[PDB]
């Protein structure tokens, strides 16, 4: 449901559901927490990691 995206600026970004890549128009578009939808170049994309709901191990 939440994945957390890291720029390659250093920026921290949680987004609603996994963001789409189009290898076609190199853009990323993913919708923030506020449901608005948004749309990044894939080359600022550092890491798309699933969030975890909680610690374990």
């Known amino acids: 449901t ?3 995206m890291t720029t ?3 920026q921290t970004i949680v987004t609603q559901g ?3 890549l189009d290898k076609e128009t190199g ?3 993913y919708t923030d927490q ?5 749309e990044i170049n ?3 994309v550092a890491q ?3 969030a975890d709901l909680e610690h374990h191990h």
């Open 2 to 4: 939440n994945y957390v």
């Open 8 to 10: 390659k600026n250093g």
């Open 18 to 20: 996994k963001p789409q």
């Open 27 to 29: 853009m990323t578009s």
């Open 34 to 38: 506020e449901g608005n939808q948004r």
């Open 42 to 44: 894939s080359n600022d």
């Open 48 to 50: 798309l990691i699933k």
